[PDB]
């Protein structure tokens, strides 16, 4: 019977690292198969009661870095919040970890792109992955943020 429902725009990023949009209760049986230790949530809105009960039942730690929303061309991605999320993401004790925002395209896309830059991927390869998820909502400003992101502090 075909019965597990990954959350919106779900993907495996690497060993122990996933990305998606916002999970709802239809996605909980699928997320249980991943044995998550952590969620990195990149939106400022409070976590719904449904989701909080899921986290408590499954022993999942919630890391929230509330990146405020803006639309092109009035978009300044907050460097500090991305870097705080990256510090949590790179700690293997937090794996398996699900990174999510609302649709998983912009905030989640920027965090994953910065991870890829730390993994020494060429920029065109980073942008191709970002574009695959963002599709018609791909933003030059997200890619410019990745282009100028200084990796020095994480090397």
Ligand X SMILES: O=C(N[C@@H]1[C@@H](OP(=O)(O)O)[C@H](OP(=O)(O)O)[C@H](OP(=O)(O)O)[C@H](OP(=O)(O)O)[C@H]1OP(=O)(O)O)C(F)(F)P(=O)(O)O
d(CA 145, CA 140): 9
- Bridge pairing between strands 97-100 and 38-41: parallel
Choose one: 24-32, 86-94, 97-105, 115-123; the region binding ligand X (CB under 6 A).
97-105
Residue 114 engages ligand X in binding (rule: CB under 6 A): no
Residue with structure tokens 């959350």? 7
CB closer to ligand X, 20 vs 59: 20
Residue 66 engages ligand X in binding (rule: CB under 6 A): no
The least distance separating ligand X from the CB of residue 152, rounded to whole angstroms, comes to 26
Helix (H) or strand (E) holding 52: helix 49-58
In the set 51, 108, 130, 142, which binds ligand X (CB under 6 A)? 108
SS (H, E, C) 16-29: CEEEECCCCHHHHH
Residue 43 engages ligand X in binding (rule: CB under 6 A): yes
- Residues in contact with ligand X by CB under 6 A are 21, 43, 69, 71, 101-108, 137
């Amino acid at each position: 019977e075909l019965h597990l429902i990954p959350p919106l725009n779900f993907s495996m990023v690497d060993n122990g690292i996933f990305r998606s949009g916002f999970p709802d209760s239809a996605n909980f049986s699928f997320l249980q198969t991943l044995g998550l230790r952590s969620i990195i949530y990149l939106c400022p809105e409070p976590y719904p009661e449904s989701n909080l009960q899921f986290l408590k039942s499954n022993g999942i730690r919630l890391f929230q870095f509330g990146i405020e929303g803006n639309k092109e061309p009035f978009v300044n991605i907050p460097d500090h919040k991305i870097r705080m999320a990256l510090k949590v993401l790179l700690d293997e004790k937090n794996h398996p970890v699900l990174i999510h925002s609302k649709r998983g395209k912009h905030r989640t896309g920027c965090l994953v792109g910065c991870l890829r830059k730390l993994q020494k991927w060429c920029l065109t390869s980073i942008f191709d992955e970002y574009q695959r998820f963002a599709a018609a909502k791909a933003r030059v400003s997200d890619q410019r943020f990745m282009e100028i992101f200084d990796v020095s502090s994480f090397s």
